[PDB]
């Protein structure tokens with residue numbers, strides 16, 4: 751495929767800053783833990799840099815196009831993605847196969863500021879049937895993987911909220927939380943080339959002590 755994975759050391763400042771973004775963006779969810787499990791923090795087991803020259807140049811080419819359409823502003827963010835297809839994504843890139851057809855902002859590729867939101871989709875929409883081994887959406891034993899991704903939003907359409915195309919004149923959609931005052935924003939792109947899966951994070955959710 752061209753993809754290689756480089757392990758980061760826990761002593762590396764880059765490992766520490768990615769872990770901190772994982773841990774600090776956990777919130778409680780309105781489903782009481784149904785989809786993603788009950789936890790306040792993670793046990794991070796490994797963080798790997800995803801290196802693929804073809805996929806990177808695909809991303810930067812599209813970033814330059816968006817930028818030039820938006821007064822030299824890519825509006826680039828680092829955002830989480832959770833999916834049963836994480837292993838296809840790191841080898842072949844994001845495409846229409848990784849879209850959420852039934853999502854609140856239409857058929858596109860969804861990203862979260864809250865790591866705990868992406869965690870709800872590790873084992874499928876709604877958490878599917880949970881981990882393959884124990885059939886448990888709150889499994890504390892099995893190893894999970896998330897992507898921390900570089901995403902080009904460009905001009906984003908703001909949706910106040912309780913593959914298709916971007917709204918005309920826009921490069922993405924922003925789902926702004928309008929009820930749960932603790933929820934962070936979620937974002938949708940409609941072209942796989944507008945994201946690069948930069949870090950692969952392997953972790954467990956941790957059982958609260960109390």
Ligand SMILES: CCCCCc1cc2c(N)cccc2c(=O)[nH]1
Pocket residue numbers: 830831832833834848849850853860861862867868869871874875936937
């Ligand atoms: C088959 C899995 C496709 C949807 C996965 C998915 C959905 C999703 C969402 N709706 C909002 C915020 C983040 C995510 C995410 O990180 N992943």
Ligand SMILES: [Zn+2]
Pocket residue numbers: 881882883884885886889890891892
């Ligand atoms: Zn399990």
